[PDB]
């Protein structure tokens, strides 16, 4: 469910830059591109942030992560931690690991539903934000 | 800069964005 969601998404992001790959949805594909035009507004695409390696990824990854959350949750950094997961999966196709999505998208998950899913809930779950976001699109 | 700091910033633009963009559409 909520990895079908994270699914979407990477497929999205990859589909997004010609790489293929085997409501909640469109409205997420809405936030993250919406966080794309601010982000590179003040900054370069995040792929020459990243260096990444096969075994230096998920603890890179993880690491960012925690430091997003690390005093709070709001939706808005929800959707940043979506843009981040799938700009690693379309750097990593770039950088010949393609393999490596399939990972990203489970940690992603596993991040979903181990550190946020509470969060989520306690604060109105998906429909709250696919209500919030509503009038943005 | 710090890749994590961009995302919270553009994270939370976004966030004060929807929040207002929701105040307006009430």
Redesign the interface.
């Given at each position: 469910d909520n990895r079908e969601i994270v699914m979407k998404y990477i497929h999205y992001k990859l589909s997004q830059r010609g790489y293929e790959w085997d409501v909640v949805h469109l409205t997420l594909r809405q936030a993250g591109d919406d966080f794309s035009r601010r982000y590179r507004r003040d900054f370069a695409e995040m792929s020459s942030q990243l260096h990444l390696t096969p075994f230096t990824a998920r603890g890179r990854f993880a690491t960012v992560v925690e430091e997003l959350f690390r005093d709070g949750v709001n939706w808005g950094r929800i959707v940043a931690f979506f843009e981040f997961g799938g700009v690693m999966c379309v750097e990593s196709v770039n950088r010949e690991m393609s393999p490596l999505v399939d990972n990203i998208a489970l940690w992603m998950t596993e991040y979903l539903n181990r550190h946020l899913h509470t969060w989520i809930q306690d604060n109105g779950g998906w429909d709250a934000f696919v209500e919030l976001y509503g009038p943005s699109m | 800069?710090?890749?994590?700091?961009?995302?919270?910033?553009?994270?939370?633009?976004?966030?004060?964005?929807?929040?207002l963009?929701?105040m307006?559409?009430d």
């Open positions: - | 800069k710090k890749l994590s700091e961009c995302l919270r910033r553009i994270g939370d633009e976004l966030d004060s964005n929807m929040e963009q929701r307006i559409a």
